[PDB]
Amino acid sequence: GFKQDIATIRGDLRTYAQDIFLAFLNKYPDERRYFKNYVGKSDQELKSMAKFGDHTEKVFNLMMEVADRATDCVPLASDANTLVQMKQHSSLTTGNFEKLFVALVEYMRASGQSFDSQSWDRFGKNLVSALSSAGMK
Ligand code: HEM
Numbered sequence: 607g608f609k610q611d612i613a614t615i616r617g618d619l620r621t622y623a624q625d626i627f628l629a630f631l632n633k634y635p636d637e638r639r640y641f642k643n644y645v646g647k648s649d650q651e652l653k654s655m656a657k658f659g660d661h662t663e664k665v666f667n668l669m670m671e672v673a674d675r676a677t678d679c680v681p682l683a684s685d686a687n688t689l690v691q692m693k694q695h696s697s698l699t700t701g702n703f704e705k706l707f708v709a710l711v712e713y714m715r716a717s718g719q720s721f722d723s724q725s726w727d728r729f730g731k732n733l734v735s736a737l738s739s740a741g742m743k
Pocket residue numbers: 637640641660661664665666668669689694695698702703706
């Protein structure tokens with residue numbers, strides 16, 4: 607289920623974080639603009655780079671903490687509020703996060719592993735509706 611998925615992801619956080627983030631960028635290439643440091647670089651160029659790995663690690667670590675504090679895939683308001691009020695997210699809209707979760711769910715469905723893909727879809731929808739409530743456009 608969802609809790610075991612969080613354990614799987616956490617067990618190999620840097621690998622899953624990199625692979626899902628690159629799935630996102632490659633599915634929605636206009637999103638790369640938000641990451642000036644990653645423009646014009648292959649997946650392997652990025653996987654060799656400690657700072658790309660460090661970035662993806664820190665993002666997915668917080669995503670797993672939000673997921674683990676959720677009840678029935680409903681995230682905490684306080685956690686949606688952290689994500690809206692981070693300086694780093696000042697330019698973003700809920701569509702940026704929707705696209706990340708579509709990529710994550712597609713990644714999980716394509717994986718061959720027994721991820722609870724539908725729970726991640728519901729988590730992402732519930733997180734988008736919480737970001738909107740906390741004032742994201
Ligand atoms: C649930 C989803 C997300 C989480 C948990 C999250 C979390 C984070 C965290 C923890 C950082 C700081 C990384 C560090 O300290 O090195 C960060 C930075 C950032 N995030 Fe997010 N993020 C999310 C979604 C997004 C999305 C969808 C976008 C854009 C499409 C975005 C754009 C950024 C940018 C541009 C930075 C600054 C990167 C840098 O300075 O190197 N994030 N995010």
